[PDB]
């Protein structure tokens, strides 16, 4: 993207001033779209001395004459050439600029246009810029951020000491990671991605992307009329324990609610009985255990059950002890079907196993399980897309690291999911996702593809809950899934 402005200037020959101009007017038009007619408003434009501020000067100049008032507070020491050009124009067109920030100047304005720092923030905002960002945040005025809210690191979404909380962010070309990962995503407000004249080739050459509605629509498997359950595949879910009788039902149903033909659960007796008492459409095979947990004595029975399915999901509610450990590692090692590995399957996994497996795998950890899995702290793995990338690539798998933004990666292509809400922050929601993913593999999508579609639909089902999200539970989420799908199409 920094490579992209460069390329469009240096190779394609677009004057950098033209790119700047297009940036600034696009902010003006985005504000108008959001606020209605802008002539009622007094605008306080906050400008640093890099090109982010230059963008600001464009905005400020283009409001001169059309709005009730415009003031620019300039807060940089030096000005980049384009910023300098544009300060020069602002002044020639009659615009007013001050360099000192009086706490009280917020009183005489309605909108703050925040053009202090963009992609060129390095390290921490302290001093004058700190005070000022805090002042705007305490002010209750309408805040519009140019490109990125000043103080979000645009590569991680990290807050550098402090950061502008925007109502609207207008970014150029493509969204940056800091709009997509938290806390940055939270401080972006409504995000608009403006087209400022980059060639389409370049825009699309981006190694990472947000999972969009159009992308999932085109990945959905076809439903040919002449079909039967076999067309839509078979899933086995190896799950449950005397501690966790409910997890398997949630997985099984996630598989069914996404269109799979046949879902066979394999769960310790009598816990298997639970599944069909609530949803008798599931088949729930009783497995005879010594203690209520899977062990090596169930390995062969499970490999037999796997011979006639298309994908196996393993992990929800298995329990985390040494019997489950021996079992899950010997099973995965010998299973020559695609595997979806989740939950306690992940907790006891030896990862050499993934390396020595000829068949493919998706792992679906939350950051607790990821931390454990790679022997790192929760804070180190959270939103760490490079770590996720290096892990997928290394172990020949797909990683789905679940979070409010979920990362989905295979080591080459990385997608970010942004559908969902805090009703998914509740036990069981992950167990539903494992089934969805297994279900889409079963219907012939690749692991990356199934995983992409699944996190999108899963999040979107949560959003369609008709009452407060905090009351959502995994059973309701199951019901909303076929609605997410209909609404997708």
């Amino acid at each position: 993207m920094k490579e992209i402005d460069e390329l469009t200037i240096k190779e394609y020959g677009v004057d950098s001033r033209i790119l700047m101009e297009r940036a600034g007017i696009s902010v003006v038009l985005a504000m108008e779209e959001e606020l209605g007619n802008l002539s009622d408003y007094r605008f306080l434009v906050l400008c640093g001395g890099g090109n982010n501020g230059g963008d600001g000067f464009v905005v400020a100049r283009n409001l001169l004459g059309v709005v009730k008032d415009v003031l620019v507070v300039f807060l940089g020491k030096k000005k980049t050439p384009d910023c300098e050009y544009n300060y020069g124009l602002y002044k020639k067109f009659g615009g007013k600029v001050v360099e000192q920030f009086e706490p009280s100047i917020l009183n005489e304005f309605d909108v703050v246009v925040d053009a202090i720092f963009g992609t060129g923030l390095r390290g921490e905002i302290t001093g004058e810029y700190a005070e000022i960002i805090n002042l705007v945040n305490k002010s209750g005025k309408v805040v519009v951020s140019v490109d990125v809210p000043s103080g979000i690191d645009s590569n991680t979404g990290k807050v550098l000491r402090t950061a502008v909380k925007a109502d609207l962010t207008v970014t150029f070309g493509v969204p940056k990671i800091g709009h997509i990962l938290f806390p940055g995503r939270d401080l972006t407000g409504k995000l608009k991605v403006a087209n400022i004249g980059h060639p389409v080739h370049l825009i699309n050459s981006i190694n990472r992307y947000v999972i969009t509605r159009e992308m999932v629509r085109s990945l959905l498997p076809e439903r040919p009329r002449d079909s039967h359950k076999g067309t839509y595949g078979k899933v086995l879910i190896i799950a449950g324990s005397r501690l966790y009788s409910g997890a398997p039902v949630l997985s099984g149903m996630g598989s069914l609610k996404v269109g799979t033909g046949l879902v066979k659960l394999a769960v310790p007796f009598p816990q298997n009985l639970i599944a069909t008492s609530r949803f008798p459409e599931l088949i729930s095979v009783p497995i005879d255990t010594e203690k209520g947990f899977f062990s090596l004595q169930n390995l062969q029975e499970c490999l037999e059950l796997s011979k006639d399915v298309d994908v196996v999901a393993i992990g929800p509610g298995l329990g985390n002890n040494e019997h489950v450990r021996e079992f899950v590692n010997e099973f995965l090692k010998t299973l020559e079907k695609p595997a979806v590995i989740d939950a306690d399957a992940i907790n006891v996994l030896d990862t050499s196993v993934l390396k020595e497996r000829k068949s493919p795998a998706v792992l679906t950890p939350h950051p607790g399980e990821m931390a454990r899995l790679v022997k790192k702290t929760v804070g180190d793995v959270k939103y760490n897309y490079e770590l996720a990338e290096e892990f997928a690539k290394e172990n020949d798998c797909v990683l789905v690291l679940k979070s409010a933004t979920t990362i989905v990666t295979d080591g080459e292509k990385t997608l970010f999911n942004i559908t969902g809400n805090t009703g998914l922050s509740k036990g069981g929601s992950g167990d539903v996702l494992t089934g969805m993913i297994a279900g889409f593999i079963a219907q012939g999508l690749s692991p990356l593809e199934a995983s992409t579609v699944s996190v999108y639909l899963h999040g979107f089902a949560a959003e369609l809950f008709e009452q407060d999200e905090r009351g959502l539970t995994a059973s309701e989420l199951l019901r909303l899934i076929p609605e997410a799908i209909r609404r997708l199409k």
């Binding site: 696009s26 038009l29 985005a30 779209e33 409504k190 995000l191 608009k192 991605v193 403006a194 087209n195």
Partner: peptide
Amino acid sequence: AWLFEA
């Protein structure tokens, strides 16, 4: 659609 994308 031309200018913006949300």
